[PDB]
Design a protein around this ligand. Sequence first.
Ligand SMILES: CCCCCCCCCCCCCCCCCC(=O)OC[C@H](COP(=O)([O-])OCC[N+](C)(C)C)OC(=O)CCCCCCCCCCCCCCCCC
Ligand SMILES: CCCCCCCCCCCCCCCCCC(=O)OC[C@H](COP(=O)([O-])OCC[N+](C)(C)C)OC(=O)CCCCCCCCCCCCCCCCC
Ligand SMILES: CCCCCCCCCCCCCCCCCC(=O)OC[C@H](COP(=O)(O)OCCN)OC(=O)CCCCCCCCCCCCCCCCC
Ligand SMILES: Nc1ncnc2c1ncn2[C@@H]1O[C@H](COP(=O)(O)O)[C@@H](O)[C@H]1O
Lengths: 320, 55, 53, 69, 101, 50, 98, 120, 459, 49, 347
Amino acid sequence: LQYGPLAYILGEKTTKKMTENSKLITVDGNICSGKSKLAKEVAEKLGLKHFPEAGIHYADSTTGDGKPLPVRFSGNCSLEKFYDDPKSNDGNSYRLQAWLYASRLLQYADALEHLLSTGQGVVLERSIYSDFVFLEAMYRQGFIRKQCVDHYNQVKKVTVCEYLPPHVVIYVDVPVSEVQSRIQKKGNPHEMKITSAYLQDIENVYKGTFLPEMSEKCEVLQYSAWEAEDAEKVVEDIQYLKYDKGPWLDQDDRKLHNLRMLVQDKLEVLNYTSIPVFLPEVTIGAHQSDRVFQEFTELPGRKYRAGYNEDVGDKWIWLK
Amino acid sequence: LLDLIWLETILPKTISLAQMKMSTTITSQKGLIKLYFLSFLITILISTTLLNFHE
Amino acid sequence: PFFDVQKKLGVDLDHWMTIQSAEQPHRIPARCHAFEKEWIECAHGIGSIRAEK
Amino acid sequence: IARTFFDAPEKNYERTMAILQIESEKAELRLKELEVRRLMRAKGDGPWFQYPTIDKALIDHSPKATPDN
Amino acid sequence: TLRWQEDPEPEDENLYEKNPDSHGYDKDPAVDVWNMRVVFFFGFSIVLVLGSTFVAYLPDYRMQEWARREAERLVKYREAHGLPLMESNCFDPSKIQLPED
Amino acid sequence: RDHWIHVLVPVGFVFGYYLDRKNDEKLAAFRNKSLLYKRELKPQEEVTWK
Amino acid sequence: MSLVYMNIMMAFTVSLTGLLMYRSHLMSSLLCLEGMMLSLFILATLMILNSHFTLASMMPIILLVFAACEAALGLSLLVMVSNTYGTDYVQNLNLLQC
Amino acid sequence: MMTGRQARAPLQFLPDEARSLPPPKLTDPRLAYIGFLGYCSGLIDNAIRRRPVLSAGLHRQFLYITSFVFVGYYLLKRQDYMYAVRDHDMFSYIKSHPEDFPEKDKKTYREVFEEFHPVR
Amino acid sequence: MLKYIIPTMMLMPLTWLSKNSMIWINTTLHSLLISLTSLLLLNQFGDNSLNFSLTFFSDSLSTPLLILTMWLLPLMLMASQHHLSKENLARKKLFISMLILLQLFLIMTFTATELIFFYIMFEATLVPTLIIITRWGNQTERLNAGLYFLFYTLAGSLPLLVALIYIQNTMGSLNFLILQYWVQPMPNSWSNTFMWLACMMAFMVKMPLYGLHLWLPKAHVEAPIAGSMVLAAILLKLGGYGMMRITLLLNPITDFMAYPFIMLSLWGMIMTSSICLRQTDLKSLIAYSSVSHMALVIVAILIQTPWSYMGATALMIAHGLTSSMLFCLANSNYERVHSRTMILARGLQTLLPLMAAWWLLASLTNLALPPSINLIGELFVVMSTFSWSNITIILMGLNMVITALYSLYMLITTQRGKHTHHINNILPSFTRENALMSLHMLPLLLLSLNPKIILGPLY
Amino acid sequence: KFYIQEPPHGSPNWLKVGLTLGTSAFLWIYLIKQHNEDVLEYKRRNGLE
Amino acid sequence: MNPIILIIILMTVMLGTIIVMISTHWLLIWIGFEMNMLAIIPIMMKKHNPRATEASTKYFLTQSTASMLLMMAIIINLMFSGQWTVMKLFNPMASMLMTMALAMKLGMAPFHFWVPEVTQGIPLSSGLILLTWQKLAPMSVLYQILPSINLDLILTLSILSITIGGWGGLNQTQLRKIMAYSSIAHMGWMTAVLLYNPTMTLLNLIIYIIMTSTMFTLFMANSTTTTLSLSHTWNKAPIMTILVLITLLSMGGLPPLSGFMPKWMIIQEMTKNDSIILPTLMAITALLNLYFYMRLTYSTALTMFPSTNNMKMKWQFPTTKRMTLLPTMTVLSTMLLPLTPILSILE
Ligand SMILES: CCCCCCCCCCCCCCCCCC(=O)OC[C@H](COP(=O)([O-])OCC[N+](C)(C)C)OC(=O)CCCCCCCCCCCCCCCCC
Ligand SMILES: CCCCCCCCCCCCCCCCCC(=O)OC[C@H](COP(=O)([O-])OCC[N+](C)(C)C)OC(=O)CCCCCCCCCCCCCCCCC
Ligand SMILES: CCCCCCCCCCCCCCCCCC(=O)OC[C@H](COP(=O)(O)OCCN)OC(=O)CCCCCCCCCCCCCCCCC
Ligand SMILES: Nc1ncnc2c1ncn2[C@@H]1O[C@H](COP(=O)(O)O)[C@@H](O)[C@H]1O
């Protein structure tokens, strides 16, 4: 393709284009912690590209024309349906969780590809290292079953071991009552159905399992609600960090070349997300999958490859 | 009696069950190197003396 | 398959150590040089099937 | 119908005769080839089944160190 | 509990509901009519009528007529000169050699 | 032609007939040589059959 | 043939039946491999020195070189094993049975 | 088999005796079939990469069928040479050993005896 | 035979370059044109067979089977375009290509002058049939039906090839024109015994023979309509054609060798007719009737008399047409009631009069009402097997009664009596279905006028 | 412009197209020349002119 | 692994096999075998997981034992002949030892135990490289010593390998074990006809290499390791299901596909030498290989197995893998029957 082993042999090394400013930052927090704009501030002070939080339609925006696909073609889940009745009989909760985790894996792969190809740092929000915490809340409230937890653990174990943790993680500490007040001031009617126990369990699994295990392989920066409103302190603290922990230290050009080889192949990245384990939440039948796939094929710009679609205005097809 | 059981028993089911039993017997090894090399030694012993393959 | 590269390119690689009647160092003869020479000259070009008998 | 589509009986007759001659020749050549292969493997005096032996161009003929050779 | 998320089984489709003049070939009336015309023309007006006419007028199949007519000659030979109608030997006994016994 | 898909089978049949006629000439080692149909050549005729 | 040929062939067969029946230890099998290599070397040089085939004296020593081309390799196939498990037993190498 | 025949002059695709044989025509049916194999390969190459199989990459299909025709023509030349060698060696051995291949009489059916087995 | 292979191969660019919904029309039209041009194979002589080239030749035996195959393809396309209306366009084109490829292999099988080429096409017919059965069937058991259909046939055909190769090392050639003049008598020995078994058991399996017939009730009732047609009307005649070609080399050892298979078929016809008397499925009833008729053809070929050969080929053609019509009737009833039970839909004469007439006519031709060609073939086989022995007529005659005991029964339970009360989706008969049954029956009724074209190569 | 990102095969690779066309033309003319010299030398050897 | 080191190691493997193929000295044969084993060991250690370590250890032990037996037979032939020409041997014991060593190197039964475990413990690239390239040098050495092998020993080894591979292929769900048992059965098929006419052996070797490469490359393209993902492939790309269906139908010895090319002509070489029981038994046993091929086709293409929800995202990303020579290899493995006399170039 564009980057191959012949390119690495011919002289295109990886550490030559990686400066000190090339840092991967994952800004974290609660549901309404206000990080969603705060990370954007860190985008416009350190000169780092900003990636919004990977929703259901991240892959729809990444490929094709960029417009979001209909929900029957991508996701097959609804966040509002989870917010209304989280104990739904069709298993919407774990399906939404699995789709969100796979989209976060795709976003992390894209961010790592951009960082290893351009040398410019990427700012993420709630990466794959801090998604299982949400899952834990879904297990503590009884929203899903133990088999969903087992399947998620299997997928995470077979997927996350081939990647690298971010350089800096920033956690915005907002209490549950302030989170509920911000949710009530948001005005979204589906978000008002969130119980206090769900947010409390999210905070508990953030402070008890994510941060104690995460601070060894990277550097944490825990911030209060008032401190996250001023990005000058955040950028000044980021710019004066002594990076000594994490597996980023013992990386040669060969390891980064192998990582770039694995990352740039998107189907190789998403190979282990759809493991053939039959669970009622994620298993789709033969006829439904056939109908959805045939309806997806006849969409504009999706029948052929990304440059061989005559119905959108691609020319010189017979000479390609 | 005949065309639903016995004719269905003598020809196809006998060889089907025999192939199933032989397939289970062949592939039930424990994956140990020592047993495999012992089988190699026994094969060499059989070929040298009992079958006279060195003549 | 035996892709005979050596005679095709005329390059000698391992034909000197094949027999004991070849070009030995300082013309040192083997203990059975005459017998091997006679056997090779007898069975040259007549085929193995004819040469066995 | 006979003039337009169908063939003459003489045409079919001589076509069948040519087919029979060709196939009989092929069968006789097949039998001769089988006999030739069997005799060549039995004896070994033909160009086939000529297994390699030691080339006599590798033999040294110069006077060696000892005379008894 | 909902094992195997699956589309529901669709109901049967009646071709006479949306088109009472359907011949049963396609739900599109023009395509159905043209398919019906093609089948009835090349199935009855071409391969049956002309085919049976071709089979009926076969030029002396397996020379079944000819073997009669030649026989009509041959008997008129051997009845005229007093010869027997058919000999017991297919081949001439003078040109065949038997092994000694 | 606006109906070019309808001249594939008839052209194939014509091609097969032509190939049959071509193949019949290569099998003419015994043309006017059979013991049953051998005959002197008529005037203005050079082969018995094509 | 002679007598020392019989003894060297008997030594080769002894080391062969030592190798083919493992005793739950990889180093012992590697020692058996080295012993069979040594027996083959000794038999080859005995025949070569008896038959005065001087130009084949390059054969055994070069042969001896390729001994390490597996033997040291065997040691490199052990340390990862001894990093996978605390010991070097051959009964721990049964993960590939399914 | 013919290994000794390929003993004096080895690793030759087509020796000096292969040039006395008539080369295959460019309209050979086997060559056309190999060109069709190349066309099928081009179709599969367009199909497995989500391209329009009858329009995308006409130069690719042309190079496919051209390389297929090239290799098939040379392989057919070698095959014809080898079959000519087989026939020549067989006829030479038949001519060289007349006592091992003696002629047999052709008895007419008026002399030979065949047993008759009735069907009844 | 190059004038028939080339249009058949060109049918695939026709079905792949066609429009979005014009594949059925174009394929039916051009296959009907091929069927029209198929009548040129009737240039038969009283002594000489029609020889085209060194590879293809057509006697008076292969010609009716070729005409039947090229006639059956448009009927097959007409039959299999109702349950595939919901199918994908690519899958529809794949199905049509499968049918075209199967027909191509069938018309290349019958004209092969070399037994190795005939055997190669005879096994090449397995792959499209197996693919059709295992892919476009309806039930689960089709997967099981994909195994019993396959590993039976190869188990008969893999030894036979070896025997054929032995002939290539013995007689010097396998050309059928050469072997008619270079044939030799087969002495009685164990080697010739097992060579006879190798050369025959493939054709006993593919006919089928009683005892080896177990794959046919399974591969007939899970297969779709096109697969049922191709098994019933053509693929069971490959065994008969192979028997008629291979019996020439196996003389005179066949006189004492054919006894156990003759007894097996003579009891298997009674056993399968009795099974037909108690079958709860229409499709299984038609399958077992096919087994009985092919056992009759096995007896006719094995006794090897001219009347037996004539009755065998007439029975083959007549049974192919009648079984195809019966399977299309069963397919129409299955498409209307969505079940295979015989006792479910009763009294259909009060709802479909024309389909009742077609059912009555098909059941009439099934029990060999004279002067149909069914009666011609069955009668001639009866005459020959009475010449063979004077007791076998009993084993014929009783069988005839049982035939008339199930076919009319297959009529009555499906046509007469009080109609069921809880079934109210009985649509009127479509024009396509009636066209299919008329195209199935009118050649069969017309062949009674001139049967001399289906009376074998020794008429 | 339709796609939100530039496809890697949006524009035809002109050097690859030229190399493919040149290779095909060279192979065709080489095969034609080889066949002509082969049939000419065959006619020379057997004298079948 | 560095790409330079990988290229150097692959070139060393090729150089070792070439050295075995082109040398006229037994010591050079053994040197090439040792170089091939030494340069093929780290290819299986590419991903650095324990299963690679077990597979490498078992392969190294088996290959070392085979090389020791080969060198012992070479030394015995030197003792009894006094030369080094790679030709027929002059001691039946040396012939037996060489046949045993080459059977262990080819993985032929009853030395077949290491083949499925080594094939399962290594990635698909190393597995394809092993099962295709490493089965070229021992077949060449067997080709060279043709007037020396005992007929009974090699025929017993062939029928044992065919029966054991056909029986072992039934009870596997992993694809690599299926390919290993198929390779063992094909090994028996090639060594069954070696003493009669080795041109058929070379034809079978070429055909088997083409079909094995096609199946392994399709496994790369679909990124499948087990039967369930191979079943799941119908949602991503149905053309891959069509290709694996026609390929597995080819490897079952079903005409008119190219897998009927070797086996049929193998029978054509056993009846000329008055052996009729053995080809019949061999075809009856190859029916088992056809059986588990049919099971694989039923799981993969002819039935529509259920899929998961996440595959929807895989509908938005086309394959960008380097499927090298895949359409040409599929066409060669499927539609090569009418060019049957092409094998006359192998004489
Ligand atoms: C063949 C194998 C494949 C089978 C499937 C084939 C599918 C394709 C079919 C193609 C078209 C059909 C081909 C076969 C045609 C057979 C018919 C044919 O041509 O026959 C030739 C025969 C030829 O007769 P012939 O041979 O005696 O005459 C000598 C030949 N000619 C004609 C040249 C002088 O035709 C007839 O017999 C027709 C006679 C006249 C028409 C009928 C008159 C009587 C009708 C009934 C009157 C009432 C009776 C009582 C009724 C009471 C109530 C029921
Ligand atoms: C579908 C199920 C039933 C299938 C039945 C298939 C047929 C049954 C018999 C097949 C026998 C094998 C083929 C024989 C071909 C003989 C050709 C020939 O020239 O014979 C003369 C040759 C004669 O030998 P020769 O020709 O080498 O010697 C020269 C001739 N003499 C003897 C005079 C010196 O016969 C043989 O070589 C032996 C024939 C018998 C072989 C016995 C072993 C096979 C046993 C049957 C296995 C069948 C499959 C079982 C499994 C099925 C799947 C589950
Ligand atoms: C009588 C004696 C005859 C001797 C004939 C000798 C012919 C030449 C040698 C053939 C032997 C096999 C050669 C290739 C061995 C396998 C190479 C291999 O595995 O390459 C790995 C490579 C990986 O590609 P990628 O997908 O990017 O990587 C995934 C991450 N590991 O790539 C792959 O995995 C994809 C596959 C690449 C190679 C495919 C084509 C070559 C092999 C099949 C033969 C094709 C027909 C030509 C030869 C005909 C005769 C055999
Ligand atoms: N894995 C998840 N499961 C459920 N909801 C999630 C998950 N990840 C993010 N969300 C929702 O995403 C929103 C947070 O986005 P933001 O408001 O931009 O911080 C809240 O509504 C969360 O409930």
